[PDB]
Design a protein around this nucleic acid. Structure first.
Lengths: 98, 86, 98, 110, 110, 98, 88, 99
DNA sequence: ATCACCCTAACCCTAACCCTAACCCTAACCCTAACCCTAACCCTAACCCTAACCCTAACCCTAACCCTAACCCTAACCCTAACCCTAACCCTAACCCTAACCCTAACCCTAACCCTAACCCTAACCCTAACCCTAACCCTAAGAT
DNA sequence: ATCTTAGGGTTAGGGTTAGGGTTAGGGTTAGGGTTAGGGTTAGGGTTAGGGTTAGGGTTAGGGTTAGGGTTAGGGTTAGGGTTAGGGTTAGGGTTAGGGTTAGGGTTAGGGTTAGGGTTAGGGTTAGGGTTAGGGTTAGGGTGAT
């Protein structure tokens, strides 16, 4: 009955993305830890800004519009442009599948 | 209805105004090349703040930039401002 | 012959004068024109509340005054009394701006 | 009597988990409600940034003639890219080191 | 049937509103639940900080021979106290000005 | 039927505290605005830190203990000491009257 | 029975002159004055104290006697120095 | 005479060597003792994980290296190549650490 | 090393004006009381992770010595910024006018929440072999003379 | 051109860890039911932008000049490079015990809802604190002795 709680991470998805961008390259454990930290940091930044945006304008819901505005506020120029493009494409594809 | 395009307004920040701002910062003697450098610095700062203010304004689906938009933009730049409805 | 103050006397008098007061040191209308010119690049046919332009002016003047204090320290560090563009550049570099 | 389950990540054509991001948004006290398209957008953005950094780090790793990415390669990738450097300007990377920079005035005269 | 109401501020011996603070905590998306003593503690701390600043600002106003407090007095109070200056290091007070300070090297030699 | 929404402020309470500390002293409109900004700023800081503390320890409730720890984190030495003393005193008095 | 502790004295001198030289070399410093070392130690001490204080605060809030890596990570994050590679 | 490098040659060599590497530059045991000593006044009888001490060491070394880069810039501003305590103090004042 | 002379900021008195503080009404928000349910406390047990200790061997630190080059101080100069004055121009302030715009109210509907079953994905665990590190050797470019 | 040295390139071999493969349990997804947050339309106050006039305070440009920044030279001391001796840290190992964490059982504290009473916000008004203007005066700067 004494079983430790499980701990989730982004290792699987980071490895998938790595195998897309560089088919031959591998990654060390420490570098994977760095990538998990990075993903958590960015998630928190974007989610916090979206929360503040919703509160300022007296809305109860976080929608993709708040996410887009937060992305535009937090990322520098070309990064923001490309990230917005990727987000809009993903949402459009998701909605197109009913 | 008609709106007129503005240009080269950075020269409106005159040499005496820059000298006054330097005086409040306790500067005694000023080189002649400071004024152009200062204009560039102010330009960069203002662009950065106004872009965020306009992003906040557009998210709300408004056309008028309010003081709260500026306050939020400054706050997220790391420069909190008191006295304008914070 | 007519009275004439030595160089630096009036500068010290001005320092004492402007550190004692609180008014804005930049003319209001030129600053407003500058704000409108800068903003017209991001979006066309924008409008501004008066308090918005006033808040911008307060922030800008505070920023420049702080920068000049740091620049003065950098100039004094180099056994000088005159501030030069390299002093501003150094101060901004150390602040993390450039 | 029910249609075979498809992941929301495959519906959006992503590698990052849309369902997990949805749960994290719901549990993180960010708002009362979360829209259906917020987790998709956020997952897409996170995936893009991850791919961004990983591509640059893989290039750096190949330059030093190595097969794995270590934190040094991540550090080099971040600090040699202007926008990634700006985004992560206040971040320390463990076992990353620094960029090899020496001031010009310090170099010998001849 | 019902006893006469007492404000929760009066029970804690405070001037700041315990009820309003409690509501702002419940509606701020800070946590799922809010304890009974959290708003009391927070209101007390806010009142303390307000009183500290106001005492120093009143002294500053009296030094300039004024009845009312203006933003200049608040600025002088904040910047002349080490702990309040540290707490508000990244804060700009509108129409506050700066402290009079001239570097000793700039003063006339003789 | 078309009436503007009410605006809340801490002006009533700030005035009460001012009359406690300096009975013969007033305050201008601008100074009161600044005081409002200060109170809102400090509220946001403390509440955010308390929320993060509750999240780290897997707790669903913000209690006086979270507020105490947040105060100790966010305030300098003597400020934190006296603020903690005031908070504890107030909570004790509140509990004493059933 | 019970494992008692012992006190520690004068460990700031454990940060030696060679170590400070190496740290300056990674920072690109070519020539070093003799009075730097003392200065450096002071600076370091201050930094450490602040971080450690915050960390201990976190540790006390959870009612633990052991300072973990996450306590340090949170303490650093709330001072504007985010650290990757130890969790979070 | 036996071979002798001129002043600054070994300094440049060391700069290159230590900018190429990533390992820690402070000895682990003395740093751990310093950490425990500093912590002993905030609370008595504390325990530390190994990773906590490693995290502290990483953060401290990164901080010091950054400060040394800024100090070097301040020293070069005054037409010197030798860093002095006044350079550290200027860098810390401008950074906002007020020293 | 005072001293005459002269400019500037500060101090004082008076009219006046506009901004603050007091008052009144009222709608909304806080307090009280009854009810319910789940987060948090508590006590036990279980494993496990840190502190304490011994050994040892190589490696890093410390101190002394020799020397050079970087730093600091002085004098000369020359050019650049401060100070002052005058002509003119552009900001400021007060006023109006209107169209754009922001806000509210009523309406309603669809997107988000909630619960349940079941099934697919991800974390924990095992095991192997391939990338990385170590040791010995040789070239190779750069430093000092 | 010449000797010398330190980092880098090559090869053979060990060994650590990253990557692939199982298994299970729990977290995501599909399906159905409910409700209130937000989107839509109309209307109405309000406020920001554009135009006008007048004047007077501020800016720009030119002339005079001193003193501060720049440069070259000379001395000196302090920091760098080197070497031998010895302290001390890094690594390996073991032990035990105090500390962290899960698991089952309670309970009371916090959320919900409705009704009613208090209080804080909005709007109006008088008067006094602050400000503008005019007149001394006290302090401090500047050239001369």
């Amino acid at each position: 009955k004494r079983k430790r709680s499980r701990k989730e991470s982004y290792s699987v998805y980071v490895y998938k993305v790595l195998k897309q961008v560089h088919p031959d390259t591998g990654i060390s454990s420490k570098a994977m830890g760095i990538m998990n930290s990075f993903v958590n940091d960015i998630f928190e930044r974007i989610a916090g800004e979206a929360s503040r945006l919703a509160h300022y304008n007296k809305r109860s819901t976080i929608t993709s519009r708040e996410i887009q505005t937060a992305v535009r506020l937090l990322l520098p120029g070309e990064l923001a442009k490309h990230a917005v493009s990727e987000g809009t494409k993903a949402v459009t594809k998701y909605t197109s599948s009913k | 209805r008609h709106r007129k395009v503005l240009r080269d307004n950075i020269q409106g920040i005159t040499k005496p105004a820059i000298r006054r701002l330097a005086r409040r910062g306790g500067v005694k003697r000023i080189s002649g090349l400071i004024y152009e450098e200062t204009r560039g610095v102010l330009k960069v700062f203002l662009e950065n703040v106004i872009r965020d203010a306009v992003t906040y304004t557009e998210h709300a689906k408004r056309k008028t930039v309010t003081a709260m938009d500026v306050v939020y933009a400054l706050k997220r730049q790391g420069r909190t401002l008191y006295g304008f409805g914070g | 012959k007519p009275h004439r103050y030595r160089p630096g006397t009036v500068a010290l008098r001005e320092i004492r004068r402007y550190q004692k007061s609180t008014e804005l040191l930049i003319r209001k209308l030129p600053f407003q024109r500058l704000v409108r010119e800068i903003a017209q690049d991001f979006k066309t046919d924008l409008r501004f509340q008066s308090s918005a332009v006033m808040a911008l002016q307060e922030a800008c003047e505070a920023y420049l005054v702080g920068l000049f204090e740091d620049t003065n320290l950098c100039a004094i560090h180099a056994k000088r009394v005159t501030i030069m563009p390299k002093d501003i550049q150094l101060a901004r570099r150390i602040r993390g701006e450039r | 009597a029910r249609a075979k389950a498809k992941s929301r990540s495959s519906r959006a054509g992503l590698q990052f988990p849309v369902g997990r991001v949805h749960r994290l948004l719901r549990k993180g006290n960010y708002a009362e409600r979360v829209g259906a398209g917020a987790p998709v957008y956020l997952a897409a953005v996170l995936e893009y940034l991850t791919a961004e950094i990983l591509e640059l780090a893989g290039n750096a790793a190949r330059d030093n003639k190595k097969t794995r990415i270590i934190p040094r390669h991540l550090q080099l990738a971040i600090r040699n890219d202007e926008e990634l450097n700006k985004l992560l300007g206040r971040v320390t990377i463990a076992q990353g080191g620094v960029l090899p920079n020496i001031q010009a005035v310090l170099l010998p005269k001849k």
